[PDB]
Amino acid sequence: MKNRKTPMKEQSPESRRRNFEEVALGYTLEEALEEAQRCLQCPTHPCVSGCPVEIDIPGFIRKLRDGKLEESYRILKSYNNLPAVCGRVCPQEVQCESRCVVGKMKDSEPVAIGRLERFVADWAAENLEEDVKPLAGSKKEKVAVVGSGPAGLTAAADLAKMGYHVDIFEAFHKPGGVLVYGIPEFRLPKRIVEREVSYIRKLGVNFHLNTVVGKTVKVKELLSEYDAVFIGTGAGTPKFMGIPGTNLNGVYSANEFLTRVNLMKAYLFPEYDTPIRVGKKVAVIGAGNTAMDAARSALRLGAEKVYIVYRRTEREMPARREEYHHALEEGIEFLWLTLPIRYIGDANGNVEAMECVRMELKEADGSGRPRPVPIEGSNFVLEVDMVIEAIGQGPNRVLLSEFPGLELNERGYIKADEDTGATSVKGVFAGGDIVTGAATVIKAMGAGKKAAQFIHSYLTGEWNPWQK
Amino acid sequence: MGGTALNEIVKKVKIAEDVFDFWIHSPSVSKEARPGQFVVIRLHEKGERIPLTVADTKPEEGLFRMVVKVVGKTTHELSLKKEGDTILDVVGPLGNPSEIENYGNVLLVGGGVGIATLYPIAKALKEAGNNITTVLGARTKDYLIMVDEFKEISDVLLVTDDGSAGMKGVVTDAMDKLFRERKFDICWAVGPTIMMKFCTLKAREFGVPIWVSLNPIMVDGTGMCGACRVTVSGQIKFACVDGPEFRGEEVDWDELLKRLAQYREQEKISYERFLK
Numbered sequence: 187m188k189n190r191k192t193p194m195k196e197q198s199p200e201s202r203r204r205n206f207e208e209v210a211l212g213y214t215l216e217e218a219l220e221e222a223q224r225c226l227q228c229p230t231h232p233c234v235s236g237c238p239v240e241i242d243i244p245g246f247i248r249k250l251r252d253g254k255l256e257e258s259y260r261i262l263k264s265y266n267n268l269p270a271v272c273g274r275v276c277p278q279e280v281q282c283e284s285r286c287v288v289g290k291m292k293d294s295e296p297v298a299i300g301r302l303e304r305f306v307a308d309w310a311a312e313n314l315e316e317d318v319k320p321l322a323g324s325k326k327e328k329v330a331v332v333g334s335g336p337a338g339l340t341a342a343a344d345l346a347k348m349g350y351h352v353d354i355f356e357a358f359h360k361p362g363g364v365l366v367y368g369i370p371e372f373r374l375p376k377r378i379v380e381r382e383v384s385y386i387r388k389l390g391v392n393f394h395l396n397t398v399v400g401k402t403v404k405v406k407e408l409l410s411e412y413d414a415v416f417i418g419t420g421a422g423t424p425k426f427m428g429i430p431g432t433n434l435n436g437v438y439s440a441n442e443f444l445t446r447v448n449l450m451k452a453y454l455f456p457e458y459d460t461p462i463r464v465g466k467k468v469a470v471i472g473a474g475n476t477a478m479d480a481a482r483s484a485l486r487l488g489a490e491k492v493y494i495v496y497r498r499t500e501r502e503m504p505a506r507r508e509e510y511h512h513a514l515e516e517g518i519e520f521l522w523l524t525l526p527i528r529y530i531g532d533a534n535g536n537v538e539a540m541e542c543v544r545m546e547l548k549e550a551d552g553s554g555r556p557r558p559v560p561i562e563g564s565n566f567v568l569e570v571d572m573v574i575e576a577i578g579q580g581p582n583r584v585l586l587s588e589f590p591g592l593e594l595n596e597r598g599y600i601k602a603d604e605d606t607g608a609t610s611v612k613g614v615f616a617g618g619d620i621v622t623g624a625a626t627v628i629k630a631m632g633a634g635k636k637a638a639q640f641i642h643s644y645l646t647g648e649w650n651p652w653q654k
Numbered sequence: 655m656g657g658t659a660l661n662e663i664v665k666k667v668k669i670a671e672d673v674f675d676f677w678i679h680s681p682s683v684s685k686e687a688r689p690g691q692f693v694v695i696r697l698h699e700k701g702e703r704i705p706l707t708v709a710d711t712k713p714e715e716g717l718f719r720m721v722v723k724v725v726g727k728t729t730h731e732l733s734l735k736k737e738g739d740t741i742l743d744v745v746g747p748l749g750n751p752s753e754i755e756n757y758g759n760v761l762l763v764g765g766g767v768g769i770a771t772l773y774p775i776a777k778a779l780k781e782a783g784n785n786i787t788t789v790l791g792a793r794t795k796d797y798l799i800m801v802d803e804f805k806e807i808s809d810v811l812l813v814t815d816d817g818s819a820g821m822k823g824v825v826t827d828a829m830d831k832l833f834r835e836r837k838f839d840i841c842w843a844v845g846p847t848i849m850m851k852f853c854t855l856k857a858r859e860f861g862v863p864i865w866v867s868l869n870p871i872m873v874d875g876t877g878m879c880g881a882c883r884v885t886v887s888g889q890i891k892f893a894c895v896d897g898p899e900f901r902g903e904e905v906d907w908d909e910l911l912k913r914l915a916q917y918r919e920q921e922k923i924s925y926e927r928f929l930k
């Protein structure tokens with residue numbers, strides 16, 4: 187009666203609980219080919235409607251079936267700049283695979299499009315490469331890309347292919363944005379990010395690392411010396427709930443936790459010089475992927491119990507299903523409809539507890555997800571030696587203020603044309619999380635590709651959005 | 655090729671038992687830096703990002719000055735870095751610039767290395783038209799001394815150390831010993847948190863407004879994490895973005911050093927380093 191996805195090799199739960207190695211190990215060729223056979227090749231291909239950049243899914247599946255693997259990769263790459271990333275991190279359960287027909291069947295799972303995108307992208311990685319020849323510097327004109335996330339990498343790459351001088355500006359010592367300091371190694375191996383950056387390096391894109399724009403170099407210089415500019419800085423500014431005890435030792439922003447853990451590799455100590463605080467009972471506040479990574483990371487650091495604390499339920503939770511399952515398999519505990527009210531510490535220095543309540547289904551939506559209303563008398567406590575806040579984060583409003591005439595939305599994100607990415611300032615484009623608020627990698631990728639195309643349309647004089 | 659390099663250590667000179675005055679090439683930091691700002695650095699690929707203050711600049715030659723006290727692996731390692739060795743990563747200038755302009759008479763105080771992070775501000779006041787007086791303190795009687803040369807040039811000098819050229823107890827005893835003068839306008843206190851705090855508490859003697867440069871645990875130094883949290887007046891502030899300079903009256907001081915003792919490891923990294 188059932189029709190399931192072809193199972194993939196995964197790390198053993200007991201062994202993988204302690205390490206940061208990738209958990210989903212990837213398809214073998216035969217497993218991939220066996221999965222590719224489940225695709226029914228629907229002429230109307232609803233799957234494609236669930237992909238934000240509209241990848242020709244049955245096509246690359248077809249050429250995979252046929253054994254023409256490069257052709258498959260070529261089909262993928264004409265749409266997605268970062269397939270090995272997206273096939274790994276896309277929440278296909280709310281995207282491409284949620285429209286898949288084979289899942290419409292009773293007791294039947296959809297085609298594993300993501301695992302296949304991954305397989306094809308990975309298979310081509312440890313096998314072939316391309317021509318090392320740089321393409322940048324043919325169109326003589328200068329475009330600056332600020333931020334080296336999916337958006338900036340994508341725009342830069344695509345622009346270098348278009349012949350332009352591409353100079354990337356990055357604040358950190360490593361490029362990749364969230365792909366380097368946010369999402370952990372056990373989800374996204376960094377060999378892939380380094381690979382893609384290197385690829386983009388060989389295109390003649392020059393990276394300015396450890397470069398914080400507005401400080402290292404003034405916005406005015408960037409505007410004066412460059413024909414166009416793309417802003418892909420994301421929404422990385424942390425916010426704290428602001429309840430009492432936010433200032434206790436053991437209390438962290440997920441930004442800081444994950445920055446120490448992922449970028450500074452504080453789990454590798456004293457090999458790497460960055461330390462990380464001990465906690466056996468840690469609380470991670472949030473139910474995003476941020477919370478899940480922070481929790482799953484804290485667990486790997488040798489914590490005994492790890493709690494997810496969420497003001498909403500399992501069916502509102504914005505986390506990737508595969509990773510939530512992994513999280514459960516690794517022993518993460520979940521508190522549905524739970525909201526902290528204060529953190530409590532001891533004589534010397536410590537978090538020792540957290541006061542929480544239970545919520546109600548009353549209020550309808552009203553931003554967020556349906557506004558939970560606190561219930562009285564349900565008030566309780568969780569004993570914790572470490573707290574991590576994964577409640578989300580907002581845009582670098584400061585850097586934005588340094589752009590004159592650059593219009594922001596109600597929440598402070600940039601206003602830019604949905605299709606072209608052009609903003610109110612002349613010659614300045616923008617895309618990724620800095621515009622939409624926190625979304626997906628694929629959307630930052632897409633935003634960068636379109637912005638690049640309209641940078642091309644702009645620097646050739648075909649299309650000009652800025653007049654009096 | 656007969657030239658310099660990016661993060662090359664152009665000069666390294668010792669000035670105390672554990673303090674080192676570096677001059678380092680970095681045209682961006684040299685050109686862009688204003689007083690009260692700082693840089694975050696990493697020495698090698700396994701390195702940690704650490705905060706240090708830009709204590710001077712020579713934009714013409716593209717140099718910036720840096721003063722380091724050896725407390726753990728990283729500062730030690732940089733102090734062991736020979737002239738010509740490069741620092742892998744240098745990020746700056748960081749932080750909010752100091753508030754400089756032509757004011758009345760000004761008093762400043764600096765302890766330990768904070769003095770070097772106190773100098774650049776002090777230097778800017780004077781070229782702004784101020785008349786300054788300075789109080790310098792040390793961490794012990796004999797060894798661990800203070801910068802002899804630089805301050806005396808800027809103004810009349812006051813010393814506080816178990817030893818030479820001045821009083822003995824504390825910098826706050828040197829303050830309040832202006833009971834005679836009492837002075838007016840503004841103040842500045844930079845050094846260990848405790849010192850700056852009590853300098854604030856010496857808003858009691860002269861009813862004086864005290865500026866302060868804070869020193870919390872930093873990672874990014876760009877405002878993306880909030881390790882460097884600070885409570886000002888009542889509201890959370892990031893010392894790397896909103897600071898490091900604040901008004902001592904507003905700063906939660908116990909909270910800070912209660913948070914500076916957050917990683918009582920590096921006990922470890924320092925030991926592992928200190929093997930031959």
Ligand SMILES: Cc1cc2nc3c(=O)[nH]c(=O)nc-3n(C[C@H](O)[C@H](O)[C@H](O)COP(=O)(O)OP(=O)(O)OC[C@H]3O[C@@H](n4cnc5c(N)ncnc54)[C@H](O)[C@@H]3O)c2cc1C
Pocket residue numbers: 275276277332333334335336337338355356357358361362363364365368369397398399400418419420421422444475476477479506582585617618619620624625626627628630
């Ligand atoms: C923990 C976490 C988990 C996530 N998990 C998923 C997932 O599973 N699936 C999915 O689809 N999406 C996920 N996302 C979202 C996705 O990673 C982001 O949407 C994506 O990284 C945004 O791309 P971006 O280039 O627009 O911005 P970012 O990647 O956020 O930032 C890119 C670059 O901007 C640089 N920058 C910022 N300011 C400056 C400056 N002044 N000067 C120079 N450089 C600057 C930064 O240094 C950074 O490198 C996750 C995000 C986080 C934080």
Ligand SMILES: Cc1cc2nc3c(=O)[nH]c(=O)nc-3n(C[C@H](O)[C@H](O)[C@H](O)COP(=O)(O)OP(=O)(O)OC[C@H]3O[C@@H](n4cnc5c(N)ncnc54)[C@H](O)[C@@H]3O)c2cc1C
Pocket residue numbers: 459692702704705706707721722723724725726727728729730767770771868869870871872898914915916917918919920921923924
């Ligand atoms: C704005 C600002 C300006 C500063 N300017 C200077 C300066 O000019 N000269 C100077 O010598 N120091 C300065 N510091 C402090 C300097 O960052 C610390 O001494 C340094 O972080 C520790 O180096 P480490 O080799 O001991 O590294 P680690 O091995 O990580 O630290 C070991 C010891 O350093 C202690 N420590 C105290 N503060 C910090 C901190 N922010 N980060 C990490 N550890 C800390 C820790 O308690 C720990 O025990 C400044 C700090 C700030 C926030």
Ligand code: SF4
Pocket residue numbers: 224225226227228231232233234243244285286287288296297299
């Ligand atoms: S829907 Fe499922 S089956 Fe029909 S094409 Fe897309 S993947 Fe193949």
Ligand code: SF4
Pocket residue numbers: 236237238239240241266272273276277278281282283299300303628
């Ligand atoms: S990109 Fe994300 S959505 Fe589009 S196909 Fe690959 S996985 Fe499904």
Ligand code: FES
Pocket residue numbers: 871872873874875876877878879880881882892893894895
């Ligand atoms: S140090 Fe991370 S925000 Fe200031």
